[PDB]
Design a protein around this nucleic acid. Structure first.
Ligand SMILES: [Mg+2]
Ligand SMILES: [Zn+2]
Ligand SMILES: [Zn+2]
Length: 1245
DNA sequence: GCGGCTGTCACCTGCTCATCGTGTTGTTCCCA
DNA sequence: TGGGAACAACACGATGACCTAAGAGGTGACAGCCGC
């Protein structure tokens, strides 16, 4: 399986595939339900329908093996051959392939220069076309032929003059004789009108026919190949008159003749000449056609494969028909399409045999063409061929593309064996690496192992008896299942897998019930809440599979998220509300025994049980040898002449009992903790534990924290009641006064001083003031010991706006058509919304529900594109010896001359290693290529630096893809990135996870358009696709003097640069809110009007580092405006993929074509080669691609076909005859092979 | 020869069932 | 096995002559065809 190539399928190739010809449009006999002969589903050409049988029955006996029968012609062998055996049908009239012609423009042929309409006319027998002209013989006989045409013109004139003499005689005779008769007053004038009618008729008819001959003559004079005679009468005239010099045809026969005669070398030569010297559109068209011409020229596959004379038939078992109950049949649409084409082919053969007129044979040939077109693609041209209902039929190419196609429904994602699912319930008694799975589910998944163990343990004498008893559900079966499930890791999974911590391996323990028991704090990795959610489950089988499961995927190991490195499996909700109650202060908690001193914590809990001490009362507790005091409290160590071993001596601390209990959950070596560990400090402590202590102890500490959090959450006293929702007394008076102001504004509106818009905006301002005032008063009112206050301030569940709506005020809401209701909801949910208030409030609820429903699929599509782009960027190198990096701001924000760590070092500079040693005082503060953790940050910010040079993938220069050292440390594992890490998929998943929760879009229209650039996920797709921003704003090309040349017809802003440069201008709208004044000094890389700068501009005028910085900053802008945190590396992966190609110009020397976005790598190597030969090298404009385009440009065509545009991709791959090498991730899961990543690398293989 | 605009190709998404136009031939049944 | 009758095949070609309803996507990317 070294490679897989596709080209054109000749007639000979199709004949070589086949074993027989399908001649009848018949599938099976409706009565006897058997294959017919030489039809669809036939048994002579395809394989036997029954294993080891033949049609007639002479060799129905199974003994025979591989022989051919002597009566029916069916060989005796297996019945699966019908899946593999193929046939063909010989067409009478050749037809064109609807892919290679009448398709996407770049693949529309262009080998024969013809417009789409001209080919539409030729192919579907509506216009003729010349396949050959004897120009040399035509010119040789042109003296003779023009003399002959002059002779015919003179004969026409001679008989015309004889008829003119006869007309004069007739006129004289009729005039004279009628005048002599005088039967009427105007006999002479009446017959003068008659004779003038005859004379005019002959004049006009003679002119018509001599002009007809002139048209035929000059048409023959100017007659070349690829010339269409739309009118058949004129073609008949030409064939009758000057035949034997030119040859014409209709339909695909003409195209076949041209593709056979036409040679490509000379065409490529002229195309190279014109592209070398071309202007405007003509050059672009020339190079576009040259692409296809060179594709056919370089390769051995001939263009004649683009016209078809034989059609292959897919094996019958891939298009089966089956008896449905009620005497019915369910059959594949392919059978109907094959029947249509065979019907029309046979009717055409009949018509040819009878020598039918041209019209009938032409109609039948056109119909056969349309039939094969529907067979290959039903929807490209005309109306589709519907099947049973009005719905369209399924074409052979419709079975490859689309969401439900073969690639995207059967080769990437498969239904699997040894799998189960069920609802998910919380087991709070589980260890981090444990899952409780129902009894029946465990029995079903582990069946074969259970039978093997039952037989081995002598509970059964044979495997079938073991199966019988397992089905019967005996007790010994259940004991054996308990024995066997041990040491078999089990992969739990949730439906939407937004990242790698969405499938996790657990150790299975056998449990009763009908639901799966899961750990309480792995609910954020899965996003699984217990509201009816379901969990799927899989069982690895091979030793390697389960070894990887336990080592890599085990839930105990997966504690840190890959998106930012913060721990994800940490306590939350009630657990944190319990540890917060444990370590909170004594405020409003009526302490007892405050100020007392205890000789141990055991004595403290004695006092607590006695009821004379509180868990949260300030008391002086002594801690024994081993306890490590707080880091902050150490410098206030006990005063004594002797040197006290603060690290390892008994000490005393004015702590609280709850904190002394909390610090027993953490490991003994951990320093004491003496502050409210609500939610954020717990995250910090868990991060420190993960980054400092080994994983087993971190899991044990997490378990202890879980147990303590639940235990103390039960006793916290947090219980929601209608009194615990405290409506502030402030709300009444505030809402009444602002209501009075609203009344005044309404009165001044109804009096006519203001407009309705002014009244609105005034009331929105008034009620925003009222809402915020009530919010702050509500925050002030409740104590900090309140239930809701406790769960919010502890960071368990809740925000302050939610509390505002519940307790104080709901406020203004999104009116219909995304507006702001002037009058707000002046009532919280506790007080009770009115009727109209509720009706108004449901608007935003509905809108948000619909928005979420759509945004799920939107983010899914975005993640699909990101994965397809970034896939195969795999760490293959331990260390490239580069010394380049990014100059990232290490400690900026010198507001009042104070060096402060930047506000986003966690996402940007953290985890990125160091290019080289940093020295500010003549000594190495940070050694080279060392993990850049917080300690180095404190050192460098203290010593005053404002930048740092970090290794990165963007600046990585390695022979084999990316290297571990430049990427940094894996944000998921903490340690250095391991070689073989599928970093691209990790980056794509990291950017895709928060996509659903962005929720950034305009709340109200606000009477603004264009200025409001797209917000949220639309913005992210806009940046990642390289699409020009909606609110585009030009960016100055060079430093210069900029002024306004506004014209009433069209406003303009014109900048002329200094340094003797050419002027530039930008057309701008009237509503521009210009951020640059007139006649001012702009610089090389500055904006002009308010908007969104194009990434293309920033790549063009500034450079490549500038576009990288701009894109990363612009995506992080929205991401960190939400609060989502993604490391900059995950964006940098996509940015690196987007800038890997260059558009080439001045390319005749470098031996390639201008354009074609040659790869940067390719451009460089071939310029090196041409310079080595001696010729100068070509030049390159850096190009910023999109994600769809950058993915579709893959060297491997399997991946491109799998992603999108299967028809176009496969057609181009066939034209180019380009093979696919196995290297890649996607294209190695299509073939079903070990991926070139993780432990599948040849090093580990 | 070079623009607009104007379509056309990509993507994103999901159990009932109505007749002719005549007349004849040969097999294959159904009854007895 | 006789007649009595059901389907699958066939061969011809009854003085008169035309659909049908269904049917609101949206957004990019682009290359033609038509206009200057
Ligand atoms: Mg749920
Ligand atoms: Zn046989
Ligand atoms: Zn590197």
């Amino acid at each position: 399986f070294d490679e897989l190539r596709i080209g054109l399928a000749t007639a000979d190739d199709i004949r070589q595939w086949s074993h027989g010809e399908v001649k009848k449009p018949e599938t099976i006999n409706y009565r006897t339900l058997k294959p017919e002969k030489d039809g669809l589903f036939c048994e002579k050409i395809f394989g036997p329908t029954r294993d080891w049988e033949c049609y007639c029955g002479k060799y129905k006996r199974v003994r025979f093996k591989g022989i051919i029968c002597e009566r029916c012609g069916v060989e005796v062998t297996r019945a699966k051959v019908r899946r593999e055996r193929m046939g063909h049908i010989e067409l009478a009239a050749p037809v064109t392939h609807i892919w290679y012609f009448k398709g996407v423009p770049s693949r529309l042929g262009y080998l024969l220069d013809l417009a789409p309409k001209d080919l539409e006319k030729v192919i579907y027998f509506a216009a003729y076309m010349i396949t050959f002209v004897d120009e040399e013989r035509r010119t040789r006989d042109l003296p003779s032929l023009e003399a002959h045409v002059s002779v015919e013109r003179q004969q026409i004139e001679q008989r015309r003059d004889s008829d003119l003499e006869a007309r004069a005689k007739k006129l004289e005779t009729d005039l004279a004789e009628l005048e002599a008769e005088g039967a009427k007053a105007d006999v002479r004038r009446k017959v003068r009108e008659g004779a003038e009618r005859e004379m005019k008729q002959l004049r006009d008819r003679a002119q018509r026919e001599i002009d007809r001959l002139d048209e035929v003559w000059n048409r023959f004079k100017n007659l070349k190949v690829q010339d269409l005679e739309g009118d058949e009468l004129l073609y008949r005239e030409l064939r009758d008159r000057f035949g034997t010099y030119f040859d014409g045809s209709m339909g695909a026969a003409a195209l076949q003749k041209r593709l056979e005669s036409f040679d490509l070398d000379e065409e490529a030569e002229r195309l190279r000449e014109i592209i070398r010297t071309g202007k405007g559109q003509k050059k672009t068209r020339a190079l576009k056609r040259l692409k296809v011409v060179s594709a056919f020229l370089q390769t051995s596959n001939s263009p004649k494969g683009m016209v078809l004379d034989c059609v292959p038939v897919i094996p019958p078992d891939l298009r089966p028909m089956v008896q449905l109950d009620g005497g019915r049949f369910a059959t594949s649409d392919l059978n109907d399409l094959y029947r249509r084409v065979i019907n029309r082919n046979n009717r055409l053969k009949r018509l040819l045999d009878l020598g039918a007129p041209e019209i009938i044979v032409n109609n039948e040939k056109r119909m056969l063409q349309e039939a094969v077109d529907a067979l290959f693609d039903n929807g490209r041209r005309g109306r589709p061929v519907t099947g049973p209902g009005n719905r369209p039929l399924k074409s052979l190419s419709d079975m490859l593309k689309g969401k439900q196609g073969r690639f995207r429904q059967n080769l990437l994602g498969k239904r699997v064996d040894y799998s189960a699912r069920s609802v998910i319930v919380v087991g709070p008694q589980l260890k981090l690496h444990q899952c409780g799975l129902p009894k029946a589910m465990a029995l079903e998944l582990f069946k074969p192992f259970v039978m093997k163990r039952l037989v081995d343990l002598n509970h059964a004498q044979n495997i079938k008896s073991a199966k019988r008893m397992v089905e019967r559900g005996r007790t010994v079966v259940y004991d054996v299942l308990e024995e066997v499930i041990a040491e078999h890791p089990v992969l739990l999974n949730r439906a939407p897998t937004l990242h790698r911590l969405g499938i996790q391996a657990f150790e299975p323990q056998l449990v009763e019930g009908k639901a799966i028991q899961i750990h309480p704090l792995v609910c954020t990795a899965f996003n699984a809440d217990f509201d009816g959610d379901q969990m799927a489950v899989h069982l690895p089988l091979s030793a390697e599979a389960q070894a990887e499961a336990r080592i890599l995927m085990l839930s105990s190991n997966n504690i840190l998220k890959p998106a930012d490195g913060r721990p994800v499996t940490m306590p939350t909700q009630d657990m944190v509300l319990g540890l917060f109650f444990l370590t909170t202060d004594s405020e409003g908690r009526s302490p007892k025994g405050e100020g007392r001193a205890f000789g141990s914590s055991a004595e403290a809990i004695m006092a607590f049980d006695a009821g004379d001490l509180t868990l949260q009362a300030k008391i002086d507790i002594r801690f024994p040898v081993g306890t490590i005091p707080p880091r902050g409290f150490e410098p206030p160590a006990r005063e004594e002449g002797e040197p006290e071993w603060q690290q390892g001596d008994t000490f005393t601390l004015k702590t609280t009992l709850g904190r002394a209990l909390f610090n027993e959950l953490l490991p003994e070596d951990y320093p004491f903790v003496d502050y409210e560990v609500g939610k954020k400090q717990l995250s910090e402590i868990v991060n420190d534990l993960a980054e400092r202590y080994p994983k087993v102890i971190v899991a044990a500490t997490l378990d202890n924290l879980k147990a303590a959090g639940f235990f103390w959450a039960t006793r916290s006293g947090v219980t929601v009641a209608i009194s615990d929702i405290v409506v502030p007394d402030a709300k009444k008076e505030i809402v009444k006064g602002y209501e009075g102001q609203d009344e005044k504004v309404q009165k001044q509106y109804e009096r006519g001083l203001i407009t309705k818009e002014e009244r609105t905006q005034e009331l929105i301002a008034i009620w925003t003031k009222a809402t915020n005032e009530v919010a702050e008063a509500m925050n002030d009112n409740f104590p900090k010991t309140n239930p809701v206050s406790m769960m919010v301030n502890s960071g368990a569940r809740g925000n302050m706006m939610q509390m505002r709506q519940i307790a104080g005020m709901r406020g203004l809401v999104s009116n219909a058509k995304n507006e702001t209701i002037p009058r707000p909801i002046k009532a919280s949910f506790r007080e009770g919304l009115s009727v109209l208030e509720y009706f108004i409030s449901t608007h935003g609820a509905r809108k948000g529900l619909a928005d979420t429903a759509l945004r799920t699929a939107d983010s899914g599509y975005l993640t699909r594109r990101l994965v397809d782009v970034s896939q195969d960027v795999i760490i293959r190198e331990e260390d490239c010896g580069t010394e380049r990096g990014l100059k990232l701001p290490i400690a900026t924000r010198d507001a009042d001359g104070t060096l402060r760590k930047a506000e986003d070092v966690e996402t940007s500079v953290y985890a990125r290693m160091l290019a080289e040693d940093v020295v500010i005082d003549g000594k190495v503060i940070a050694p080279a290529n060392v993990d850049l953790g917080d300690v180095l940050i404190d050192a460098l910010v203290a010593h005053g630096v404002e930048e740092v040079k970090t290794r990165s993938i963007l600046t990585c220069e390695s022979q084999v893809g990316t290297c571990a050292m430049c990427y940094g440390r894996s944000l998921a594992t903490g340690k250095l990135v391991d070689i073989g890490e599928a970093v691209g998929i990790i980056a794509a998943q990291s950017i895709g996870e928060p996509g659903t929760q962005l929720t950034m879009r305009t709340f109200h229209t606000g009477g603004v358009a264009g200025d409001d650039i797209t917000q949220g996920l639309p913005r992210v797709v806009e940046l990642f696709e390289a699409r020009t921003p909606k609110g585009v704003a030009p960016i100055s090309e060079a430093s210069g003097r900029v002024r306004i040349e506004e014209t009433e017809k069209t406003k303009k802003i014109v900048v002329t640069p200094d340094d003797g440069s050419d002027e530039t201008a930008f057309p701008i709208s009237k509503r521009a809110r210009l951020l640059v004044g007139e006649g001012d000094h702009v610089e090389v890389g500055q904006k002009l009007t308010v908007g969104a700068t194009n990434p293309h501009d920033v790549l063009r005028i500034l450079g490549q580092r500038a576009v990288q910085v701009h894109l990363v900053g612009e995506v992080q802008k929205v991401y960190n405006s939400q609060g989502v945190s993604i490391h900059d590396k995950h964006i940098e992966i996509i940015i690196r993929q987007m800038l890997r190609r260059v558009t080439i110009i001045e390319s005749g020397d470098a031996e390639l074509l201008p354009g074609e976005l040659v790869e940067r790598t390719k451009f460089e190597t071939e310029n090196r080669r041409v310079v080595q030969e001696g010729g100068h090298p070509a030049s390159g404009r850096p190009q910023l691609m999109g994600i769809t385009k950058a993915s579709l440009a893959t060297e491997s065509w399997l991946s491109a076909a799998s992603f999108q545009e299967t028809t176009r991709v496969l057609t181009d791959a066939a034209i180019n005859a380009k093979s696919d090498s196995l290297i890649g991730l996607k294209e190695n899961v299509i073939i079903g092979k070990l991926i070139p990543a993780g432990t599948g690398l040849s090093r580990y293989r």
